[PDB]
């Protein structure tokens, strides 16, 4: 009956790094996605499994707002089926996805002068993540045949590395704060009419 807190997600002061994407649960509220579509601040807005113009016409069981930050070259791989680095070691979207993907420029928000090293991502992992998996654990990658199991070194790589965003960086390599909305088609409580 009350209005959903999409401002608690999109207008958040900061987003967790991609390897530990925040998972805000939205329910027991009436959602108005139109202000999302009609907003002119979104660089991208692509919904899979539902048309963007009919969002405030269906009714959803629950809403999950996976919020994180990646680079401009990495936004393209936030999509079902597509593989890469983000879609294989940080956040793999399921093949049968029924939600939305939102990303907008954040050059003046979370990219400080000289290089903001606050955002991290997983270069290496043993295998590809299952869809909707959070590998927050930071264990030394044993790339080589020597089981070091300790301080990083030769072929013992730290999996978490920083983007290092700068204001002078190119547009294609700039921080795009992604907010993947996920819906499921059962009692439903995050809709209006």
């Amino acid at each position: 009956t009350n209005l959903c807190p999409f401002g608690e997600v999109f207008n958040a002061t900061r987003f967790a790094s991609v390897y530990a994407w925040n998972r805000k649960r939205i329910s027991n509220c009436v959602a108005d996605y139109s202000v999302l579509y009609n907003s002119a601040s979104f660089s991208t807005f692509k919904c899979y499994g539902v048309s963007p113009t009919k969002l405030n016409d269906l009714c959803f069981t629950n809403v999950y707002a996976d919020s994180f930050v990646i680079r401009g070259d990495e936004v393209r791989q936030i999509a079902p089926g597509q593989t890469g680095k983000i879609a294989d070691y940080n956040y793999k979207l399921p093949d049968d996805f029924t939600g939305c993907v939102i990303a907008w420029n954040s050059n003046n928000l979370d990219s400080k002068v000289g290089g903001n090293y606050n955002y991290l991502y997983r270069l290496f992992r043993k295998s590809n993540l299952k869809p909707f998996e959070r590998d927050i654990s930071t264990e030394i990658y044993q790339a080589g045949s020597t089981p070091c199991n300790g301080v990083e070194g030769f072929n013992c790589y730290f999996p978490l590395q920083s983007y290092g965003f700068q204001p002078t960086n190119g547009v294609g390599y700039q921080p795009y704060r992604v907010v993947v909305l996920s819906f499921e088609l059962a009692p439903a409580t995050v809709c209006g009419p």
Partner: antibody
Amino acid sequence: QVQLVQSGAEVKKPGSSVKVSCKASGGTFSSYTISWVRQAPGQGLEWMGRIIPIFGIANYAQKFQGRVTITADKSTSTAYMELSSLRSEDTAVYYCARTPLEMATEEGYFDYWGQGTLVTVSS
Amino acid sequence: DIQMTQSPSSVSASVGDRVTITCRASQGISSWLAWYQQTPGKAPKLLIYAASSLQSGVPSRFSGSGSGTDFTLTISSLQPEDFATYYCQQANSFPFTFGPGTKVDIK
């Protein structure tokens, strides 16, 4: 026929810093790990720290950790070594050597080397 | 932290002789090794990697083998060009250590 070319023979006073370079002329940026090796005159080779330009990870030697930092500018394929607070008896002839990288595992055995910036504090 | 040490540096071989240089690792480095060659006024050129795989681009004279800690380098015939210092490093520990240096030279 990959060849590595460094800067000139930098001559800086003790306590300062240098920014010697190493241009990896030839070879893709995802197949070498630039490793810097120093040689004092009359003394055997000594290794400070490697960098992986494609990954960006760069772990150093515990003797030179913090003392020495390395940056790999993949835009122009010229790995940079910064000798912060060059003092004591650091005067040597610093080489740069690329250890081949296969897939994602570093291999070592520095094969292709530079000519060496003879960083010496002398007239 | 693996302090390597070769055979005594003083080696005298005129030409076409057999000069063997052996370096032993303080710790266990399996079969990893990289023998080099310090020509005077030039960068070392890799000779043997992994202690069994001979590097491409150098003669078959520069051969070595071994396992565990005791590693060897053998030269079938000392050509006049090979009047250089020979170094070995490890590929197990990350703080790579080069041996003190065995130099085959005139007296």
